[PDB]
């Protein structure tokens, strides 16, 4: 007593590259130096 | 009996996600934070 579909395949990832976008940051920088004064040698 | 022999197949090294695509995936990138830190650490000119 003697005695399989075929096709075309496209595979896809889950994508992991996190989304970039630029951001504008507005801010001010106040700096306070302080000094002493005697003769000609500022401390 | 005519049995065809089994063909040798060369398995390839399969790369799903690229290396440049792997670190590309983190919201926090330590390399560019530490760098961003020393970039800040050099803000004083007289």
């Amino acid at each position: 007593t003697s005695m399989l579909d075929e096709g075309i395949m496209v595979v896809y990832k889950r994508n992991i590259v996190a989304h970039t976008f630029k951001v504008r940051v507005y801010q001010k920088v106040l700096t306070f130096r302080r000094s002493y004064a005697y003769h000609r040698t500022t401390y | 009996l005519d049995i065809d022999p089994l063909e040798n197949t060369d398995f390839r090294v399969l790369e799903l996600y690229s290396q440049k695509e792997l670190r590309s995936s983190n919201v926090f990138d330590l390399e560019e934070i530490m760098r961003e830190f020393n970039s800040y650490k050099q803000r004083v000119k007289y």
Side-chain angles (χ1 to χ4, degrees), chain A residues 1-2 4-43, chain B residues 1-17 19-44 46:
Chain A
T1 45
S2 37
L4 279 266
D5 279 339
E6 211 182 358
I8 352 182
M9 192 183 69
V10 171
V11 224
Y12 269 84
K13 284 188 293 209
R14 199 50 66 120
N15 187 80
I16 53 174
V17 266
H19 173 246
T20 30
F21 66 94
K22 296 266 241 173
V23 155
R24 282 170 309 268
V25 171
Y26 312 95
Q27 34 151 16
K28 277 193 175 151
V29 212
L30 2 180
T31 332
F32 309 104
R33 207 63 98 294
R34 7 194 294 96
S35 71
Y36 204 96
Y38 239 111
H39 13 290
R40 226 180 63 138
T41 71
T42 12
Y43 289 165
Chain B
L1 260 195
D2 280 328
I3 331 175
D4 311 274
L6 188 37
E7 295 311 325
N8 158 85
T9 85
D10 284 342
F11 295 97
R12 65 229 224 77
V13 270
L14 287 164
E15 186 207 64
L16 218 234
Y17 293 115
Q19 268 293 346
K20 308 186 290 288
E21 169 178 18
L22 282 170
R23 104 135 159 186
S24 205
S25 87
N26 305 292
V27 226
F28 299 100
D29 173 42
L30 173 59
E31 218 270 46
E32 89 165 343
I33 311 180
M34 225 56 224
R35 174 106 60 187
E36 201 56 34
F37 171 73
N38 108 309
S39 195
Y40 150 99
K41 216 156 66 169
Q42 243 90 313
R43 284 215 80 247
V44 260
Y46 304 128

